[PDB]
């Protein structure tokens, strides 16, 4: 016992408001939005330039057409490092955000995010024991505090855990089992809450290769899998050229350049997207396990100008429409990664300071891709 038990008020199991299986719950979600660079920000909720989450933001998210939010959350920096006790004020703050999202009729996915790296970069035999202890202590606290929310609230145990081979995958499986066990131990509605488990690095190919089973669960058919998607890197995220490769500015059939053809993709186009999502359809969806596409987005390149900018924005928009549409077609639930930024190399579709739409072109792309428009 490195840390005290935080399973201090375990409750009678309660299935009130928790009647949906994972499959039934997934049917209710076609488009999600990540509250990025906010509650997981190192230094505090506003430390990465976004305002504190407001009811007004969550209202805008719902009214704009999203069914769900994924809320990355930081915890370690709020915790006593001797005892693993999380700040009561921070637990309450998280709870308040969850309540607002539910009040706006959104489904809500809470996680432990990168969180300074304590679990995420340490999927190793050397860290296994101490990290299982922290994973347990944190999840006991988070689940206890958020226990009374109905099925609008889902938990995700980890974010992008860095498991690179079969040995590290067994360590991740331990961490995921510790998560499910901690949640379930708290009882109440947590006996039946749908939980989301992350593939290795949330990478589709590594997950295909390394995944074995879901953690064992006392509940029936209450688990989903999670992967993320930023393929191809050169387009979605790459900010400078390297010896090994160039940034792609352009993407998608119809939106390629005839002049700067070195900025058209050399890989990662439509057929590759289909092939990757097909892997997750076979591995999970076809076995009765929904897949959360927990993050995707291709950043804006507003350092481009004139016709290059115009072309870039067209292919960027189409990329988001295409990923959304092809995900949904294969049982993957697409959650857009929004970092709140409206500047170069950002992904904010809302102006957080004014609760307005900044990037109507991407928003339209997502809604069209979801069949909402």
Numbering used by the authors: 96 to 468
The study reports:
In contrast, His6-GH5D was produced as a stable, intact, active protein (calculated mass, 44,222.2 Da; observed by ESI–MS, 44,222.6 Da) in excellent yield (150 mg L−1). Despite sequence identities in the 25–40% range, the structure is similar to the catalytic domains of many GH5 enzymes, most of which are annotated as xyloglucanases, glucanases and lichenases, with typical alignment values of approximately 310 residues aligning with an rmsd of 1.3 Å. For example, the structure used for molecular replacement, BoGH5A, overlaps with an r.m.s.d. of 1.1 Å over 332 equivalent Cα atoms with 40% identity. Minor differences are observed between the two structures in loops at the end of core helices.
